[PDB]
């Protein structure tokens, strides 16, 4: 988590976008071409809000379940075959 989060917020692509969002094309503050930076909003949108949510949604996200349904005599068969004898 700690390495993933530090990457997901401060990766080279995200950093490049941020520094291009603060680059100016004029010194006059009222005529500045700098625009709002997408760093934190993008980081929160993908990694952080989702991790705050998983904080039982965690099970739903990380379950990948495989439950095979066996009805009939095969259920009785699977029971004795794979459980300590009665």
């Amino acid at each position: 988590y700690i390495y993933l989060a530090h990457f997901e917020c401060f990766s080279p692509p995200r950093l490049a976008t941020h520094l291009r969002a603060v680059t100016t094309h004029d010194p006059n503050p009222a005529a500045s071409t700098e625009q709002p930076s997408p760093l934190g909003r993008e980081a929160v949108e993908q990694f952080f809000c989702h991790v705050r949510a998983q904080l039982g949604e965690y099970v739903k996200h990380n379950v990948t379940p495989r439950e095979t349904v066996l009805d009939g005599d095969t259920a009785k068969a699977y029971l004795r075959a794979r459980t300590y004898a009665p």
Binding site: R66, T68, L70, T74, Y78, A81
Partner: protein, 150 residues
Amino acid sequence: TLRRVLGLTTACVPEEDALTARGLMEDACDRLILDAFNKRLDAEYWSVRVSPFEASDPLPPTAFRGGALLDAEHYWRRVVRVCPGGGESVGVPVDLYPRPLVLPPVDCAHHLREILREIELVFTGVLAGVWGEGGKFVYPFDDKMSFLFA
């Protein structure tokens, strides 16, 4: 399965028929592997006749002790792949041991794979022959229904 799948001549776009056919083929595979469990201990049933020309499993040093049973082997060698211990699959020449046989559980995770291989060959032929081609019917044996035996 083929009798049921060519009974789907009900008027439909070819694309729909491919899916309602593949579903039935997967269901037939399911009903076959389910019935395979109820005969997991019949080693003679899970036996393959190897010819003296085909590559064969190596003879265990105790199959040379069948007495008046080694004489019956003239053409075919009936072999069943059992799984002693773990990981290792070893072949047992079925007709060179006295009966009733006592064996480790039969490695149905090997015979059923080959039976399923030829079933998918037939099913890929029919799927790509009646309706549009491009579909290799594969049954996820290793994931869906592998647990039953291994």
